[PDB]
RNA sequence: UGAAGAGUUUGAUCAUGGCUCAGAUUGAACGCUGGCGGCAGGCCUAACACAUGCAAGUCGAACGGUAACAGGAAGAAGCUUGCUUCUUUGCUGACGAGUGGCGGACGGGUGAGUAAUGUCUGGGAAACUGCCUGAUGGAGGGGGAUAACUACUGGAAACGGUAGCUAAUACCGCAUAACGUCGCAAGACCAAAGAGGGGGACCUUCGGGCCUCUUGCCAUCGGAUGUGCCCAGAUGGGAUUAGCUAGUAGGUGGGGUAACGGCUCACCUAGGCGACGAUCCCUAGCUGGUCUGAGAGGAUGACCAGCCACACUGGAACUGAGACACGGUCCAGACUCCUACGGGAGGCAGCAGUGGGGAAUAUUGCACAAUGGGCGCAAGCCUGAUGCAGCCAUGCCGCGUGUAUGAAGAAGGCCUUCGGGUUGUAAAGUACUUUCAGCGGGGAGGAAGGGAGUAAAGUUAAUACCUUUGCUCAUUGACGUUACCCGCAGAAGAAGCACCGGCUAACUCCGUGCCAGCAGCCGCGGUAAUACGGAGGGUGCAAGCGUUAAUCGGAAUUACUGGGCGUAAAGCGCACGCAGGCGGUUUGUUAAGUCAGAUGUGAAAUCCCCGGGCUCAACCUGGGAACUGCAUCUGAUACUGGC
């Protein structure tokens, strides 16, 4: 015994306690544009696209989504905005 | 494995000469070949066609002393490149240190050259042997030891072998007890009642 | 990851070691990606029993793989 | 341009056939009998089971630290007057515990599951990818925690829980803002860790600012090696298995992922599959290959090569490139094991001994020396990996148990209308000579470097390290009757087992008398039994010999090569007919199939021929020759398909 278990099954509650409320804070920001897609005016979405993009990279340099997961969070909600005015 | 049976038997039993205890009496005597023949073929059989096949097959055997398993390994050795199981056979048997330890007069026969290889009175190549069932090439030679050139049976041997025919496949000088391979033997060069008619079908029908 | 190692050979008792270019992965004496040379340890009683072959070795190494330091060592009966 | 046959239905004859047998395979037992080596292997049997001891480490050149060792440094002694000694001090070499990183998803083991995205084989698109290696930019400044150490608690306790202190390349803000985010595009947005060496101007108790070097850190994108997914081909039994789905059948928008997908939540419909064998139970992992044979075919995968699955039995998460992770986390249950009797701890399917099963399968050995891999920019460590020692009539292979000479042929036995024969050149003796055993005498090679002195534009700041080379110090073996070879007194310790009418050879004389016991089959046996038992011999093999389940050949007896259907074995009582399958002759045309050509493949082994090296040979190795096959891209269209 004497093994790594304890740094990571779990001490990975202590990066719970940090991800999980960066993670839910996020999502409130894309569900805050997500719902804006339904018009009118392209402005709505746009702002509230340039309010969540600035949160979400701020988790996208290091740990929760620093390796792919921040652009999968916008390339198809850029394909959602641009259909509209 | 060996025969425990006097060696004599075998030969009048035969009815022929199998080289069998041989020393200074040299051939004939006191081997009683069709005088004491025994208990049966004086008033030869008839018998079976598995015969001539077995006893056949026993007589191409024993005369040099080679064990079943030896005698197939062999007839697989000269079912080699076409070179026919009635003749490339007698190059395994005649090839073998046992019987060019006798060939070479160390011994006055087969048995008593392999046993001369068992108690490592012989050297191949300036080597030491104790296996007696290997095989001799061109170019190989083959001597026995200080240690044991005054045994009175290689004594024996040797004025054995100047009563026997010269063999054209291996050279021996007297003075140095020694001796080289120089081609392998040939049918109609080995010149001798050897059988043909059974080694040419063996282990099959 | 990939170092330029020894191949025992010969299984028991009887060893033969080939030097050989081969992943951590896997195998401990064959599968190997390319051999190198030999270190043969009964050779005739001949100069005969070591063999490298520098230039891909050093290509190897060049382009990333180990070299063990055993082997660098032996570099030099080959002369040099 | 390729090859084992015989016996036997009857009063007997000829066809045909059931069966028995030849030689292997061997990953064995019996049970007599047992003189010794050489090589290999060691539970195909219950995912049944166990005490005790092991099997995974490591770095202070990431870091707070300093019990211990020695120096440097500042003092104090012996006077030894140049060193020895003592105290004090993390400055330095360093290091016990801990923080941190790497590895422990490997090397292995087992075969429970599974007729299957599990295996073997070739491609693909929407993809990643620690390790290895590259480019182009960045490289400032703060803070909250927590172990060690302590306080206390359940304690019978390995402890590990409840609370406290403190540090980092651990963990979180600030500063900076493209090669990147998304797109055709303006444009918003965010991280890092430095660490250890070396040195010149001026000066110091070096307290060097600052540059330079090595090796790391962040981003972005490549190279490589691997891997997740998607496609097309090989992969049990049962058709008296006939029913099977239902994230199934076809669409829509988010969320999840490296990424396809009913991965996952919603919503939009009602089908989809199957007798041309869907689907489900029973059994079973699969394959390089091995075994058999002339081959087809059949059998089979241990051992030596390669995947998958599985970790008390069942189940949940984290960590990560990858795992419901043999020696980790978290639970449940069982069974061992322990108890201070309050409850506590364990994983043999890594390695050892062993409980138990089975006809049945190696020692609780020695060592990290060699070599693979793991840490550390390295000396050095870890290892039941590996390298050695010990075991076996278990196999494959090999040797010995003494040679000469010794009679019409002894004494005895056994056969003999008693002439003779046979045991038997065997013995008695007479002349010589030793293998292995035993006991001694010699003796390889496995082992090579690192630390340093030295010294060059290789590197740099052209006097360290680093890079590199010769010599000279330093200096590594568990194994030793090592591998290999030679001797010594002495026949010294050394032979058994099966079989004997016909097939299929060796047997005469007795014993028993349809009794007792044999085999592959008829059967052998009632008073003259070649088969049973006994005497004396014969025949074959030999440290063995006989004997067998289990796999092939022979078996053309399932015929693909290679058969038969009037009557032996068979046309299925007879007419119509869809799919299926078949189809005259000729000009075009497609080019799937075919053949051609080319590019890849058929690994390592192995079968065959010839070498090398270890008693022969096997084997382990080196080269040829094969592996008649397979995947694709072009050509030709005779012919099958197609138009």
Not at chain 2, 5 to 33: H, N, Q, Y
Not at chain 2, 43 to 61: F, I, N, T, W
Not at chain 2, 192 to 203: F, G, K, S
């Amino acid at each position: 015994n004497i093994k790594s278990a304890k740094k990571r099954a779990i001490q990975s509650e202590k990066a719970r306690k940090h991800n999980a409320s960066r993670r839910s804070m996020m999502r409130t920001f894309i569900k805050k544009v997500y719902a804006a897609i339904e018009a009118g005016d392209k402005a709505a979405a746009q702002k509230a696209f340039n309010e969540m993009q600035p949160i979400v990279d701020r988790q996208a340099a290091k740990g929760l989504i620093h390796k792919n997961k921040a652009a999968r969070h916008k390339a198809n909600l850029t394909a959602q905005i641009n259909k509209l005015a | 494995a060996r025969y425990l049976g006097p060696k004599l038997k075998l030969s009048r039993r035969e009815g022929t000469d199998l080289f069998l205890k041989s020393g200074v009496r040299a051939i004939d005597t006191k081997c009683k070949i069709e005088q004491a023949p025994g208990q049966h073929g004086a008033r030869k059989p008839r018998l079976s066609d598995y015969g001539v096949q077995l006893r056949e097959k026993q007589k191409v055997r024993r005369i040099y002393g080679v064990l079943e398993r030896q005698f197939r390994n062999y007839y697989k050795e000269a079912a080699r490149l076409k070179g026919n199981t009635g003749e490339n056979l007698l190059a395994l048997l005649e090839g073998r240190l046992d019987n060019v330890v006798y060939r070479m007069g160390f011994g006055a026969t087969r048995a008593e050259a392999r046993q001369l290889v068992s108690h490592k009175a012989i050297m191949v190549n300036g080597r030491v042997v104790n296996i007696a069932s290997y095989q001799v090439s061109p170019n190989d030679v083959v001597s026995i030891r200080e240690k044991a050139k005054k045994q009175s049976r290689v004594k024996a041997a040797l004025e054995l072998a100047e009563q026997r025919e010269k063999p054209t496949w291996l050279e021996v000088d007297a003075g140095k007890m020694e001796g080289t391979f120089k081609r392998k033997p040939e049918r109609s060069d080995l010149s001798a009642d050897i059988n043909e008619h059974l080694i040419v079908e063996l282990y099959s029908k | 990851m990939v170092t330029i190692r020894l191949a025992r050979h010969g299984a028991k008792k009887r060893p033969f070691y080939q030097v050989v270019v081969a992943d951590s992965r896997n195998a401990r004496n064959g599968r190997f990606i390319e051999r190198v040379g030999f270190f043969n340890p009964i050779a005739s009683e001949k100069e005969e029993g070591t063999r490298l072959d520098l230039d891909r070795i050093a290509h190897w190494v060049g382009q990333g793989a180990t070299i063990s330091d055993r082997v660098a060592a032996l570099i030099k009966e080959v002369n040099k």
